[PDB]
């Protein structure tokens, strides 16, 4: 079964975090639907689960706080909280738990995770510049610099380049913002006769860039 989570990348403090997970097949009413979070530092914690009947069960320390809803007509379900504070920054996963229930509970099939950062600071679109190659294998890249918040996805030629590509983790520079760079190793000979494009996707600011790299 496929699960996909969507929602905001940035939520300022004391507002209301709103997340939505979307499920494919299964089918519905074969699974309880839970949410789990994992702070970026380290640690895994469970918050709550819901069933299509509407019946719920939350983490006690987070009751009167978390609220899980469900729509069985569009195959999706959602989360709200609350008053979010500054220490709720984490990667959020939707997940499945077998029917019955299965008192020996375990989470089979997870989402891919959506990182929600909470800060009084504002969001910022990226400034992306070309790491042009030149000068038997050359290396060229895209520098996604000064953006907020994490994460940003970098592909090449609309995901055509999976070979020789590496995308690096971001770095928190003195500004308090993030920056990272992706690189690709390709044959030298090819250069000049070929076009290279880094496709940068930054969702919390809804911007989407596609920089073009050509040798010096």
């Amino acid at each position: 079964v496929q699960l996909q989570e969507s929602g905001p990348g940035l939520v300022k403090p004391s507002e209301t975090l709103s997340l939505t997970c979307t499920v494919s097949g299964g089918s519905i009413s074969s699974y309880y639907w839970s949410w789990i979070r994992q702070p970026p530092g380290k640690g895994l914690e469970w918050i709550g689960y819901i069933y299509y009947s509407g019946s719920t069960n939350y983490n006690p320390s987070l009751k009167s706080r978390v609220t899980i809803s469900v729509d069985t007509s569009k195959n999706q379900f959602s989360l709200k909280l609350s008053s979010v504070t500054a220490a709720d920054t984490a990667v959020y996963y939707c997940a499945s738990l077998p029917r019955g229930q299965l008192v020996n509970a375990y989470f089979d099939y997870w989402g891919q995770g959506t990182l929600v950062t909470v800060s009084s600071a504002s969001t910022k679109g990226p400034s992306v510049f070309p790491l042009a190659p030149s000068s038997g294998t050359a290396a060229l890249g895209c520098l996604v610099k000064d953006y907020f918040p994490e994460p940003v996805t970098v592909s090449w030629n609309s995901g055509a380049l999976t070979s020789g590509v590496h995308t690096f983790p971001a770095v928190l520079q003195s500004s308090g913002l993030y920056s990272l760079s992706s690189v690709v190793t390709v044959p030298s000979s090819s250069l000049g006769t070929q076009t290279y494009i880094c496709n940068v996707n930054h969702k919390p600011s809804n911007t989407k860039v596609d920089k073009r790299v050509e040798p010096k």
Binding site: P60, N104, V171
Partner: protein, 209 residues
């Protein structure tokens, strides 16, 4: 209330690794096991103490007794360099996970780092900014130290460096960023990035043209 497991476990290729999740009590509680590779979401490796999901190989078994659940990895291989979490309820009775366990298969081949130094592109120059990019990859293990220099003189500040991270080829990867101002770039004979790896060190050099 939480399940305690070690934060570190050490293993050589082909030997057997045992991880211990522990509460009071257990066994009478069902302990499952999750594996999480860096950058990816977890994946079920054990459910119901001893069982294993579909798509998990023979060499994956977990037990449970008294006040300790365990996981055993017969013939540990490089494919298994992830984090490992436990899970129960405990005891009120919402769900709870372990604290996290870091497996490491060492005795792996060494590799001198391949370094690549990119100078500031045109755009950033024509935007009152400059940033040098030192890229380190294909190197094991991941204990590097980066130092920058201008001409022969060592750059002091304006330097920010990432923290060693895993890759795909079961290696490591790092980067270094030199934050500059366009005159400091155009008013020098050369800039250089030196990566030190155990004893082996590798430099790279660029110059304004």
């Amino acid at each position: 209330y939480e399940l305690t497991q070690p934060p570190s476990v050490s293993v050589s290729p082909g030997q057997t690794a045992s991880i211990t999740c522990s509460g009071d009590k257990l066994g009478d509680k069902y302990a499952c096991w999750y594996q999480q590779k860096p950058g990816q979401s977890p994946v079920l490796v054990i459910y119901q103490d001893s069982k294993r999901p579909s798509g998990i190989p023979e060499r994956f078994s977990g037990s449970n007794s008294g006040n300790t659940a365990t996981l055993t990895i017969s013939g540990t291989q490089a494919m298994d360099e992830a984090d490992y979490y436990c899970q129960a309820w405990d005891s009120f009775s919402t769900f709870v996970f372990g604290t996290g366990t870091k497996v490491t298969v060492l005795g792996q081949p060494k590799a001198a780092p391949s370094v690549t130094l990119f100078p500031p592109s045109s755009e950033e120059l024509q935007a009152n900014k400059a940033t040098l990019v030192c890229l380190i990859s294909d190197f094991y293990p991941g204990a590097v130290t980066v130092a920058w220099k201008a001409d022969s003189s060592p750059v002091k500040a304006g330097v920010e460096t990432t923290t060693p991270s895993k890759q795909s080829n079961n290696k490591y990867a790092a980067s270094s960023y030199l934050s500059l101002t366009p005159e400091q770039w155009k008013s020098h004979r050369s800039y250089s990035c030196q990566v030190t790896h155990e004893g082996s060190t590798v430099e790279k050099t660029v110059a304004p043209t």
